[PDB]
Design a protein around this motif. Structure first.
Motif, PDB file in Angstrom:
ATOM      1  N   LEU A 193       0.788  -1.221   0.000  1.00 43.64           N
ATOM      2  CA  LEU A 193       0.000   0.000   0.000  1.00 43.64           C
ATOM      3  C   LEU A 193       0.825   1.279   0.000  1.00 43.64           C
ATOM      4  O   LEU A 193       0.240   2.366  -0.038  1.00 43.64           O
ATOM      5  CB  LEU A 193      -0.943   0.003   1.208  1.00 43.64           C
ATOM      6  N   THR A 194       2.153   1.195   0.046  1.00 35.68           N
ATOM      7  CA  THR A 194       2.999   2.380   0.030  1.00 35.68           C
ATOM      8  C   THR A 194       4.088   2.223  -1.023  1.00 35.68           C
ATOM      9  O   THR A 194       4.360   1.124  -1.513  1.00 35.68           O
ATOM     10  CB  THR A 194       3.635   2.656   1.406  1.00 35.68           C
ATOM     11  N   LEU A 195       4.713   3.351  -1.355  1.00 37.52           N
ATOM     12  CA  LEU A 195       5.724   3.405  -2.403  1.00 37.52           C
ATOM     13  C   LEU A 195       7.018   2.755  -1.926  1.00 37.52           C
ATOM     14  O   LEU A 195       7.629   3.215  -0.956  1.00 37.52           O
ATOM     15  CB  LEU A 195       5.969   4.860  -2.796  1.00 37.52           C
ATOM     16  N   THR A 196       7.440   1.690  -2.603  1.00 38.74           N
ATOM     17  CA  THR A 196       8.698   1.044  -2.268  1.00 38.74           C
ATOM     18  C   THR A 196       9.843   1.735  -3.003  1.00 38.74           C
ATOM     19  O   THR A 196       9.649   2.701  -3.745  1.00 38.74           O
ATOM     20  CB  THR A 196       8.657  -0.446  -2.605  1.00 38.74           C
ATOM     21  N   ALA A 197      11.062   1.236  -2.785  1.00 36.34           N
ATOM     22  CA  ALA A 197      12.221   1.793  -3.473  1.00 36.34           C
ATOM     23  C   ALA A 197      12.162   1.504  -4.968  1.00 36.34           C
ATOM     24  O   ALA A 197      12.501   2.368  -5.785  1.00 36.34           O
ATOM     25  CB  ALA A 197      13.508   1.245  -2.858  1.00 36.34           C
ATOM     26  N   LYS A 198      11.728   0.297  -5.343  1.00 37.79           N
ATOM     27  CA  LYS A 198      11.529  -0.022  -6.755  1.00 37.79           C
ATOM     28  C   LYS A 198      10.466   0.877  -7.375  1.00 37.79           C
ATOM     29  O   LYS A 198      10.683   1.471  -8.438  1.00 37.79           O
ATOM     30  CB  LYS A 198      11.143  -1.497  -6.914  1.00 37.79           C
ATOM     31  N   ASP A 199       9.302   0.980  -6.723  1.00 36.58           N
ATOM     32  CA  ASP A 199       8.248   1.875  -7.195  1.00 36.58           C
ATOM     33  C   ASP A 199       8.765   3.297  -7.371  1.00 36.58           C
ATOM     34  O   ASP A 199       8.380   3.997  -8.314  1.00 36.58           O
ATOM     35  CB  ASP A 199       7.069   1.875  -6.216  1.00 36.58           C
ATOM     36  N   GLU A 200       9.635   3.743  -6.465  1.00 35.80           N
ATOM     37  CA  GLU A 200      10.141   5.109  -6.535  1.00 35.80           C
ATOM     38  C   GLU A 200      11.050   5.300  -7.745  1.00 35.80           C
ATOM     39  O   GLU A 200      11.020   6.354  -8.391  1.00 35.80           O
ATOM     40  CB  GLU A 200      10.876   5.453  -5.241  1.00 35.80           C
ATOM     41  N   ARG A 201      11.857   4.287  -8.074  1.00 33.54           N
ATOM     42  CA  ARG A 201      12.754   4.399  -9.219  1.00 33.54           C
ATOM     43  C   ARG A 201      11.993   4.380 -10.538  1.00 33.54           C
ATOM     44  O   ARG A 201      12.434   4.996 -11.515  1.00 33.54           O
ATOM     45  CB  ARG A 201      13.795   3.278  -9.187  1.00 33.54           C
ATOM     46  N   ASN A 202      10.857   3.685 -10.589  1.00 34.39           N
ATOM     47  CA  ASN A 202      10.006   3.659 -11.769  1.00 34.39           C
ATOM     48  C   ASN A 202       8.953   4.764 -11.755  1.00 34.39           C
ATOM     49  O   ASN A 202       7.919   4.633 -12.420  1.00 34.39           O
ATOM     50  CB  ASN A 202       9.336   2.290 -11.902  1.00 34.39           C
ATOM     51  N   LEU A 203       9.196   5.841 -11.013  1.00 31.22           N
ATOM     52  CA  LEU A 203       8.276   6.964 -10.896  1.00 31.22           C
ATOM     53  C   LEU A 203       8.896   8.187 -11.557  1.00 31.22           C
ATOM     54  O   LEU A 203      10.078   8.477 -11.345  1.00 31.22           O
ATOM     55  CB  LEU A 203       7.960   7.261  -9.427  1.00 31.22           C
ATOM     56  N   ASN A 204       8.104   8.894 -12.357  1.00 32.33           N
ATOM     57  CA  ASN A 204       8.543  10.121 -13.005  1.00 32.33           C
ATOM     58  C   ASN A 204       7.794  11.313 -12.424  1.00 32.33           C
ATOM     59  O   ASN A 204       6.664  11.186 -11.943  1.00 32.33           O
ATOM     60  CB  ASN A 204       8.328  10.066 -14.520  1.00 32.33           C
TER      61      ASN A 204
ATOM     62  N   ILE B 152       0.310   7.444  -4.305  1.00 32.38           N
ATOM     63  CA  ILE B 152       1.605   7.653  -4.945  1.00 32.38           C
ATOM     64  C   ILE B 152       2.181   6.336  -5.447  1.00 32.38           C
ATOM     65  O   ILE B 152       2.849   6.301  -6.489  1.00 32.38           O
ATOM     66  CB  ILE B 152       2.566   8.367  -3.978  1.00 32.38           C
ATOM     67  N   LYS B 153       1.936   5.236  -4.732  1.00 30.07           N
ATOM     68  CA  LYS B 153       2.353   3.930  -5.231  1.00 30.07           C
ATOM     69  C   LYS B 153       1.680   3.621  -6.559  1.00 30.07           C
ATOM     70  O   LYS B 153       2.330   3.172  -7.510  1.00 30.07           O
ATOM     71  CB  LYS B 153       2.028   2.843  -4.209  1.00 30.07           C
ATOM     72  N   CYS B 154       0.371   3.862  -6.643  1.00 29.73           N
ATOM     73  CA  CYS B 154      -0.363   3.566  -7.866  1.00 29.73           C
ATOM     74  C   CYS B 154       0.049   4.485  -9.008  1.00 29.73           C
ATOM     75  O   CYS B 154       0.027   4.071 -10.172  1.00 29.73           O
ATOM     76  CB  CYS B 154      -1.864   3.670  -7.609  1.00 29.73           C
ATOM     77  N   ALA B 155       0.428   5.728  -8.700  1.00 29.76           N
ATOM     78  CA  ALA B 155       0.905   6.631  -9.742  1.00 29.76           C
ATOM     79  C   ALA B 155       2.223   6.152 -10.334  1.00 29.76           C
ATOM     80  O   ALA B 155       2.515   6.429 -11.503  1.00 29.76           O
ATOM     81  CB  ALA B 155       1.054   8.045  -9.184  1.00 29.76           C
ATOM     82  N   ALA B 156       3.024   5.432  -9.550  1.00 30.90           N
ATOM     83  CA  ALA B 156       4.302   4.911 -10.015  1.00 30.90           C
ATOM     84  C   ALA B 156       4.154   3.576 -10.730  1.00 30.90           C
ATOM     85  O   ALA B 156       4.815   3.343 -11.748  1.00 30.90           O
ATOM     86  CB  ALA B 156       5.265   4.761  -8.836  1.00 30.90           C
TER      87      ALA B 156
END
Length: 404
Positions: free
Chosen positions: A141-152, A190-194
């Motif tokens: 349910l939250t933004l992980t480090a992988k999710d963060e790297r694939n986020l623009n 924010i997780k889903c946006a990434a």
């Protein structure tokens, strides 16, 4: 209030931000504990606990213009007070996003560490708090480090214009007269946006990951079917910080179509709830919505914010041995004068055999906002929540915004 006046001359706050959060939050918190008929010892216990446990993780005091990590709890703070009305008393709830200054100054961009710091302090004083569900649900349910790297920055700037803040976790301390029970909220926006997944995919996937024996799958499918039919996505999830087997999950939706027909569609799960208690509660809702004059703001989250208007919200409660999901409706009250709200609340309380709540509701509200004209004010009482059972009857909660 005596406990605030008394603890103020005995507590040595280590920095100016805790000092300012104390004098900002403790007076109204003390008034609510007095109004709720908490004992004098719980007034001191919970005020002192706020000072020792919560104020350290409220972050830098958000002075006007101060460049800090910001939240919308209470409208503009990292802390929000609410109240649940019973017959001969009330229950106060403290909700806050744990945050430290590192989030405001570049060392924790999505504020991931502060909730871990708070729990390591909370569990020392409230021993019944179990955070196994925090460790289980955080990944889903939250933004992980992988999710963060694939986020623009394009997906995040679009999300932030509709929902303002970067909040991932909110902790709620429910101050019951028998002891504190804690709840945690997870915001997967924010997780889903990434990752591109839907909010329902994140929330219901998280529940099924914890619910291995499928005790909740019939409730999850009934709710998921209504969301898919009524064309709404799950917004966020809540859980009790207890043993994962004995917890309650609550899935929230936020609908920018603030109409009574849309509220009734969600209250009955698009007709999937047919019991008598859903029918009786719907009629008590219908009258409250009507007399309050719940404002239908513009659907666009752009213009709804500049008008200061909120959407409707609901949650659906799920426990293991539960027949049907249990709804609760959140009616937005911003834009409605406080005296008008207090008139409908007083009439409600006396209609439903709560005469003590009706006698003191107006004077208690005026004291929360000393010296303020409640006929002009329209942004103090922000949410009215409603749930109904035949056992409990209708029970209401008010969520308060801080003055500007």
């Amino acid at each position: 209030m005596i406990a605030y006046h008394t603890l103020t001359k005995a507590l040595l706050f280590p920095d100016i931000d805790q000092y300012q959060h104390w004098h900002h939050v403790a007076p109204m918190l003390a008034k609510m504990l007095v109004d709720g008929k908490y004992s004098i010892h719980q007034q001191y216990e919970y005020l002192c606990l706020f000072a020792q446990l919560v104020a350290p993780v409220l972050g830098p005091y958000p002075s006007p213009g101060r460049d800090v990590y910001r939240c919308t709890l209470g409208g503009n703070m990292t802390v929000e007070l609410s109240q649940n009305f019973q017959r001969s008393g009330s229950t106060t709830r403290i909700a806050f996003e744990p945050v430290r200054y590192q989030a405001s100054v570049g060392h924790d961009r999505f504020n991931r560490t502060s909730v871990n710091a708070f729990f390591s302090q909370l569990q020392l004083l409230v021993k019944s708090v179990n955070i196994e569900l925090h460790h289980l649900l955080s990944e889903h349910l939250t933004l992980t480090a992988k999710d963060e790297r694939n986020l623009n920055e394009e997906q995040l700037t679009k999300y932030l214009t509709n929902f303002q803040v970067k909040t991932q976790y909110v902790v709620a301390l429910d101050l019951r007269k028998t002891g504190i029970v804690a709840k945690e909220y997870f915001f997967p926006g924010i997780k889903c946006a990434a990752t591109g997944q839907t909010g329902s995919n994140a929330c219901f996937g998280a529940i099924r990951a914890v619910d291995k024996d499928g005790h909740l799958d019939s409730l999850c499918q009934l709710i998921e079917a209504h969301f898919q039919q009524s064309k709404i996505d799950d917004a966020f999830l809540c859980c009790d910080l207890v043993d994962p087997a004995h917890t309650r999950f609550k899935v929230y939706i936020a609908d920018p179509l603030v109409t009574l027909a849309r509220a009734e569609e969600h209250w009955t799960l698009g007709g999937r709830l047919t019991d008598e208690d859903a029918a009786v509660g719907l009629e008590i809702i219908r009258g409250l919505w009507s007399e309050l004059g719940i404002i239908q703001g513009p659907l666009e989250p752009s213009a709804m914010m500049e008008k200061g208007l909120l959407p409707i919200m609901l949650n659906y409660e799920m426990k293991a041995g539960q027949r049907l999901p249990k709804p609760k409706l959140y009616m937005p009250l911003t834009g409605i004068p406080e005296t008008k709200i207090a008139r409908i609340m007083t009439a409600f309380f006396q209609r439903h055999d709560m005469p003590e709540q009706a006698e003191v509701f107006m004077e208690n509200l005026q004291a929360y906002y000393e010296g303020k004209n409640l006929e002009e004010a329209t942004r103090y009482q922000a949410w009215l929540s409603f749930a109904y059972t035949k056992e409990k009857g209708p029970y209401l909660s008010i969520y308060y915004f801080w003055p500007e």
